[PDB]
């Protein structure tokens, strides 16, 4: 039985980058050929492994992390990057063994008047550790006076929305991203 790469790549709805969606793939035959014939990906970049020798090695688990970001910040998905989507939403380790795949989804994620269903974390006290997610919506104390959940002056709500519309530039349109991290440990 082939590993499911049509329920991760061809799914109906993707998760926001702050609450990204991790799926552990195991106990199957990893048929990555589905990613070699697909001509929609705008980025297929492999770190650690060669992008054609993914079949040769046998791994314990393959974690597919899927989310939706903008076109400007697809480059922030890589080892040793900084930004708003690289230390507050999704952080990759400095020694990463996996592959990042990103393709334009303006025709799925952008509706008339704006699709404000895709949020991203703008404020956070400290940078994320690799492969950590934060789904908290607590008020960010950006000043010097405790907020206690009122969201006023110098107390901002962290989760800012994405203004995706079909008229945006190709660099401001929604890109769907899937990060396949290959995890190998001492086990079958």
């Amino acid at each position: 039985n082939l590993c499911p790469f049509g329920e991760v790549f061809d799914a109906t709805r993707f998760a926001s980058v702050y609450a990204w969606n991790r799926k552990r793939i195991s106990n199957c035959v990893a048929d990555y050929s589905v990613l070699y014939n697909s001509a929609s990906f705008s980025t297929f970049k492999c770190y650690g492994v060669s992008p054609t020798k993914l079949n040769d090695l046998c791994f314990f688990n393959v974690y597919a992390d899927s989310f939706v970001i903008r076109g400007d910040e697809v480059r922030q998905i890589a080892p040793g990057q900084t930004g708003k989507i690289a230390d507050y939403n999704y952080k990759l380790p400095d020694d990463f063994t996996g592959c990042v795949i990103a393709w334009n989804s303006n025709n799925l994620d952008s509706k008339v008047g704006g699709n404000y269903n895709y949020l991203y974390r703008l404020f956070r006290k400290s940078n994320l550790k690799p492969f950590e997610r934060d789904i908290s919506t607590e008020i960010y104390q950006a000043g010097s006076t405790p907020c206690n959940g009122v969201e006023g002056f110098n107390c901002y709500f962290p989760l800012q929305s994405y203004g995706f519309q079909p008229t945006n530039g190709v660099g401001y349109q929604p890109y769907r991203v899937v990060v396949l991290s290959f995890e190998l440990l001492h086990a079958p």
Partner: peptide
């Protein structure tokens, strides 16, 4: 020069 190894190594956009 790019940190990673792309399947589309022909594309110049795959080099930072």
């Amino acid at each position: 020069a790019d940190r990673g190894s792309s399947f589309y190594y022909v594309r110049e956009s795959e080099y930072t």
